[PDB]
Structure 1
Amino acid sequence: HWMPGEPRPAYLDGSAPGDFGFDPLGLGEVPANLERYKESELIHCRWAMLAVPGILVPEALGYGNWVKAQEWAALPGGQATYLGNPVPWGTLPTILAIEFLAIAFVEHQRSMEKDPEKKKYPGGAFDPLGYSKDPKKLEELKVKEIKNGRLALLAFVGFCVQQSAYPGTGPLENLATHLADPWHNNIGDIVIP
């Protein structure tokens, strides 16, 4: 339970993976709306669980934080770089053309599926290593996946919020700053001036 001593909603029986009876606003009363929300939550968790490795590793190697990598496109004629090496196809109009075309096909392909179970865990060709053979392990795996995704979403929220308070600073820079003098570099001096 998300809070002991609180009654659970009737539609949250606790049988779904990663279900802890959390719905204070009652946004999932409609059976059709609840089924869609699980797919959206899984998509968000999967997308955010890939950004975290890509937001710290480039910074930890001294290539700059995650917001400096987008400044070149505002400049006229700016060219992209990777591992310190400029890419020949790093022009702005070329970058958008491949990005839109490549993902407009996969997302539309995902939309066309009609079986609700496959919209979340399609199986088949996306599971080459055969981790879905055991139904007993599958439930604990789904619980592990759901539990980590919300943590990654919270981590991304922290990443985004810390940037607003300290412009031009990276999350690892934030950790280093806090580690030096913990009792004066923290949330307190921001909440009250």
Structure 2
Amino acid sequence: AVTDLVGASTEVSNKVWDPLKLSENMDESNLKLVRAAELKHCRVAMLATVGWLWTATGTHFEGMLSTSSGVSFADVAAAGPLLGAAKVPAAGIWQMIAAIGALEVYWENKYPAAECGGDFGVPRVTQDPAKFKEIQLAELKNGRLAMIGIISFACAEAIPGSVPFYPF
């Protein structure tokens, strides 16, 4: 059932790209699971690329991130996108992870990944399923490019010389 999906990209001549044959023997309720994992990776990667660009360009908020122990948003931004990740206090990291996990638990109990392949029922911008398949393919391609891009940003910030066309 891997030949159906949406992910058939014209960059690989509109056929399924599985050189290691990872989806040869995987069955339903796992194919939908790996599609849900890919879609969540897509969305988190796109949000991560936008946030990384916002931090690297410098933007940041105005105020004090944790008035008990200093640390302004300018202090977080000035350390860089990667090195300015430990400048956040541990309580802020735990609160962010707790809110994300509450959303994860609610959406997993409401829309299980094994049954719903990455579909959490967010409205929908079009009917006419051909256009919707085109929009799904656009989402998949954008998310895959963002998956490559955020790891590229992390590698270029940590190891200089890699990613030659890296801004900042």
Question: Out of 15, 19, 22, which is 1:24 matched to?
Answer: 19
2:150 maps to 156
Scaled by the length of structure 2, what TM-score is found? 0.68
Give 5+ residue unaligned stretches, structure 2: 9-14, 60-76
Pairs within 5 Å for 1:35-184? 35-61=32-58, 63-64=77-78, 65-73=80-88, 91-93=89-91, 95-112=92-109, 113-114=111-112, 118-123=116-121, 126-127=122-123, 130-166=124-160, 174-175=166-167
Query: Shift of residue 133 of structure 1?
Result: 2.8
Query: Shift of residue 110 of structure 1?
Result: 2.0
The aligned amino acid for 1:111 is: E
Superposed CA RMSD = 2.9
Q: What is the total number of aligned residue pairs between the two structures?
A: 140
Scaled by the length of structure 1, what TM-score is found? 0.60
Residues 94-145 of structure 1, C-alpha deviations (whole Å, 9 max, x = no match): x14422431222111122234856442232xx32xx5133323211100111
C-alpha distance in 2 between matches for 1:102 and 1:118: 22
C-alpha distance in 2 between matches for 1:97 and 1:150: 28
% identical equivalent positions: 25
C-alpha distance in 2 between matches for 1:115 and 1:151: 23
C-alpha distance in 1 between matches for 2:50 and 2:19: 32
2:71 maps to none
Contact kept? 1:55, 1:66, Cα under 8 Å: yes
Residues 72-113 of structure 1, C-alpha deviations (whole Å, 9 max, x = no match): 24xxxxxxxxxxxxxxxxx533x1442243122211112223
C-alpha distance in 2 between matches for 1:150 and 1:67: 21
Give 5+ residue unaligned stretches, structure 1: 1-10, 74-90, 177-193
Query: Shift of residue 166 of structure 1?
Result: 1.9
